[PDB]
Ligand code: BCL
Ligand code: BCL
């Protein structure tokens with residue numbers, strides 16, 4: 112009967128769809144490796160998909176996935192055990208070395224562009240005429256760390272032009288240099304900006320940007336990685 | 352084995368209980384203390400379902416059914432064969448689900464990410480606990496809980512619904528359905544939009560988020576944006592389950608008559624209650 | 633600890649008139665006002681909207697459907713505004729009686745007005761479908777939205793058109809009313825021997841469920857990695873960042889496998905479209921091929 116033919120047919124379709132979906136989700140991070148970076152013996156039952164090529168806009172070239180995977184950076188970790196499946200201990204300062212929750216990825220050292228080929232993220236001072244339309248304007252507020260000490264003051268907001276949202280606070284430190292803080296890791300209060308992730312002494316270590324009016328995808332990863340890493344690595348200096 | 356980028360993230364720390372004792376992986380799986388608790392509760396639960404299959408005299412998965420205590424037992428303990436096994440399995444299931452959530456918290460802490468995922472999962476646990484713990488207790492018997500069986504739990508849905516007439520008329524049920532339907536609409540649109548930008552017409556460059564905002568402005572005059580759609584998806588899906596929990600906690604407690612009759616509050620408002628014509632006069 | 637459910641600060645710039653590509657800019661409206669209320673949760677900008685031939689046709693056709701039902705509701709309310717608001721949920725524009733079969737010969741008061749409303753709805757939805765295709769083509773984007781919308785249209789078409797035709801009468805179709813379409817749904821299940829025994833109804837529920845499961849998981853995941861720019865999904869596809877890596881590893885460590893930034897959107901589109909795809913088949917087979925799902929289930933055939 113027809114209903115029996117339809118349900119059987121549906122389960123065969125569903126099995127093919129799951130195969131297709133699983134192989135599409137192996138375009139990054141595969142093949143699987145042993146802890147020493149060599150290819151693992153057991154890759155699982157699904158094969159790597161045939162490569163696909165993305166044409167990137169604004170003449171930035173192509174990406175083909177899957178393709179040669181490497182960290183393209185030194186990883187300052189060592190084994191804690193003689194068998195597989197244990198943690199790898201940082202060998203230096205995990206904040207500076209960019210490991211664990213402080214990790215960053217070697218993304219392109221170019222800024223993300225909008226649909227017109229302009230820098231997506233600009234300081235508000237260089238974005239005509241972006242302004243704070245609602246909520247507390249953080250510009251001019253002191254910035255407090257998790258040790259409840261003042262680390263600096265906000266001197267601008269870095270805005271996503273096309274999506275009209277605040278992405279970073281630009282903070283001036285005691286030495287008159289500035290750093291970016293991700294908007295998602297600060298609390299704007301009436302009289303201060305509070306940063307739970309970092310103690311006052313760790314603000315100088317936030318990676319600096321090489322141009323004052325743009326930030327690259329590489330720089331964003333180092334900054335956001337460093338700040339998130341403070342949740343674990345600044346915990347001794349976090350009061351309550 | 353490890354994803355190509357995985358090693359740098361596999362550092363010690365982030366555990367809530369036991370320091371470095373359970374701070375390891377088995378293949379891709381993180382363990383931790385709550386990995387051990389999950390295994391213990393799950394293994395004990397599966398054994399008790401097996402022992403239930405023995406007493407019922409069937410190994411067919413489509414027939415096995417663990418029933419709660421009959422109403423006469425109230426909120427008391429019951430003999431294993433007639434509702435005790437259900438009670439112990441329910442403690443094991445609760446233990447496995449909460450352990451699973453707290454394991455997700457340990458993983459969040461090691462990766463330095465927000466706690467939104469276990470927070471979201473907790474709403475599903477609430478819904479489960481509404482059906483097997485909160486509603487039964489407020490009604491005064493375990494027997495109002497649902498049985499653990501593939502088809503017998505559907506029998507319970509049908510019998511529980513039709514006890515109050517057409518359950519469509521539960522107004523909290525109406526809101527829950529609207530969120531479930533809207534969530535599925537929003538998920539289809541979100542998947543479609545991102546894929547349509549990443550996979551444009553053959554030979555064209557990847558589109559930008561600006562194309563995504565533009566497409567929706569052209570179509571409906573409004574784009575919620577890339578952050579907005581993820582906030583929206585989280586809220587639609589949690590709201591669906593919140594109103595689901597609500598529609599059942601009020602059923603058999605504050606309201607125990609036919610749900611269709613509840614709507615007479617509106618029809619009998621004094622200013623139009625007695626006017627001739629229409630459906631209700 | 634800031635959760636990123638609501639924005640702490642809104643910033644505003646010049647109204648964005650959008651990308652051009654091959655869009656006819658003559659058919660775009662002006663920008664609407666900025667909503668500060670909407671701006672706490674997503675974008676503040678209302679408009680512009682695009683309105684060409686298909687847009688006006690769809691919108692006028694849709695209003696005629698809506699007004700046609702409204703006029704019937706007023707008639708049923710004896711033109712009394714107090715009765716209209718009292719009995720709003722109880723009014724119903726019913727299809728023609730079984731007598732009239734698939735004929736367009738039924739009088740207005742006994743299903744003719746149902747056919748007129750249905751005609752207008754048919755045009756409104758199908759022209760709107762054309763619009764979802766064409767607005768994507770003008771911007772050089774894939775047709776994913778149009779193909780996903782077709783899955784919704786399938787269940788709608790089965791309920792109002794395809795199944796009534798195969799059963800040989802418009803009486804099998806859904807009435808236009810709030811409580812009446814609920815009564816119809818309940819009735820449909822009783823008459824077909826309980827839809828819980830329809831295996832396509834079971835799958836449809838699994839996908840509806842799965843859509844809430846998956847959007848809870850995906851939404852929570854992207855908010856959890858927004859501190860690394862996770863919601864910038866297209867650039868994370870082009871150039872994987874720590875956001876995409878942490879998102880993958882959360883799920884690999886939790887349940888033993890993971891998605892990519894692109895791959896999760898393929899899981900997403902299919903979990904959602906399978907709801908109405910499986911659903912439409914379940915309804916199409918009810919009364920045409922299978923009179924009683926209990927009885928069918930006892931034979932598995
Ligand atoms: C004849 C039946 C009645 C009816 C009677 C009822 C009754 C009775 C109930 C509902 C409930 C619901 N009804 Mg109703 N309902 C009817 C018709 C409908 C129609 C329709 C189109 O007609 C729709 C769309 C709905 C929709 C709904 C939802 C709002 C809700 C179910 C979702 C939920 O609670 O999830 C919540 C999710 C969970 C509870 C899942 C929890 C998961 C746990 C935490 C984890 C499990 C892990 C697992 C064991 C691990 C597996 C192992 C791994 C795979 C390895 N009903 C008709 C009129 N309906 C239910 C409700 O609201 O419950 C609160 C409910 O009890
Ligand atoms: C939510 C409101 C009602 C309810 C009303 C209905 C209705 C109506 C239907 C189901 C159906 C199902 N229900 Mg139910 N169901 C309820 C509560 C539950 C609970 C629970 C709270 O613990 C579980 C585990 C289930 C599980 C199930 C599945 C057997 C099936 C498909 C679910 C799905 O795809 O979801 C989405 C989740 C995913 C897609 C993720 C995958 C989850 C897997 C598939 C779950 C397998 C569970 C396994 C069989 C349990 C034993 C494993 C133990 C380790 C031994 N229901 C409550 C009481 N349920 C459908 C069915 O076909 O039943 C025959 C169906 O039509």
Ligand code: BCL
Nearest residue numbers: 784785788817818820821827833836837840911912914915
């Ligand atoms: C007593 C009632 C029966 C029952 C009878 C039915 C019947 C009959 C049907 C379902 C259907 C479904 N049932 Mg059931 N169902 C029951 C119990 C349940 C329970 C439960 C017990 O918990 C659940 C969870 C469900 C869940 C479901 C869904 C999975 C499914 C609907 C999917 C959907 O997205 O449609 C919602 C989406 C649509 C209808 C698509 C609409 C698309 C169109 C194009 C939109 C037009 C918009 C228009 C122009 C208006 C414009 C608006 C303005 C712009 C604002 N049922 C009981 C057993 N159920 C449907 C199905 O597919 O079954 C197989 C269906 O026909």
Ligand SMILES: CC[C@H]1c2cc3[nH]c4c(c3C)C(=O)[C@H](C(=O)OC)c4c3nc(cc4[nH]c(cc(n2)[C@@H]1C)c(C(C)=O)c4C)[C@@H](C)[C@@H]3CCC(=O)OC/C=C(\C)CCC[C@H](C)CCC[C@H](C)CCCC(C)C
Nearest residue numbers: 393396443444447451471472474475500501841844845848
């Ligand atoms: C709140 C919004 C939606 C949601 C969200 C959600 N679910 C989640 C998560 C989130 C955010 C997770 O992080 C978590 C996960 O890891 O997903 C992969 C999960 C999860 N949601 C799951 C299932 C699930 N969620 C559902 C629903 C929903 N989840 C909501 C609609 C449903 C439905 C609709 O029925 C199901 C079936 C799992 C895949 C997973 C949690 C896995 C887990 O807790 O593992 C630990 C437990 C075991 C290994 C099994 C223990 C066995 C027991 C001891 C015995 C069996 C008892 C049970 C009562 C038997 C009853 C069976 C009968 C009813 C058939």
Ligand SMILES: COC(C)(C)C/C=C/C(C)=C/C=C/C(C)=C/C=C/C(C)=C/C=C\C=C(C)\C=C\C=C(/C)CC/C=C(\C)CCC=C(C)C
Nearest residue numbers: 698701702750751754788789791792793806808809810813
């Ligand atoms: C206050 O006064 C004003 C003026 C504003 C008017 C008020 C209006 C009001 C109050 C309207 C309310 C409307 C409501 C509540 C409508 C609800 C509709 C519902 C719940 C519909 C549900 C399902 C509908 C389905 C499944 C319909 C499917 C239709 C089709 C598939 C079209 C089929 C077409 C047919 C049969 C004819 C085709 C003919 C040809 C020649 C091709």
Ligand SMILES: CCCCCCCCCCCC[N+](C)(C)[O-]
Nearest residue numbers: 129133154155156157888889890
């Ligand atoms: C509810 C359906 C979802 C489950 C589908 C099963 C997919 C399993 C994929 C395993 C991948 C494992 N490995 C070794 C390749 O990483």
Ligand SMILES: CCCCCCCCCCCC[N+](C)(C)[O-]
Nearest residue numbers: 246638639640641669670672673
């Ligand atoms: C779902 C769309 C509408 C959402 C509107 C909700 C308004 C929230 C207001 C937040 C209050 C401002 N605050 C204190 C968070 O900065």
Ligand SMILES: CCCCCCCCCCCC[N+](C)(C)[O-]
Nearest residue numbers: 572573661662663664678679681
């Ligand atoms: C989903 C509801 C949102 C609707 C927003 C549409 C805004 C319309 C803009 C009106 C401006 C018209 N005009 C010609 C004066 O520019």
Ligand SMILES: CCCCCCCCCCCC[N+](C)(C)[O-]
Nearest residue numbers: 831832833834835838842902903
């Ligand atoms: C995107 C694919 C996800 C796969 C989820 C499959 C869930 C299985 C549901 C089993 C229901 C089967 N039944 C009883 C209706 O025949």
Ligand SMILES: CCCCCCCCCCCC[N+](C)(C)[O-]
Nearest residue numbers: 155156377378379380887888889
């Ligand atoms: C019917 C739905 C249930 C599906 C459960 C399967 C879970 C997939 C687990 C994948 C782990 C495979 N592994 C260990 C090789 O990575």
Ligand SMILES: [Cl-]
Nearest residue numbers: 586589590593
């Ligand atoms: Cl809520």
Ligand SMILES: [Fe+3]
Nearest residue numbers: 541545854865
């Ligand atoms: Fe997304």
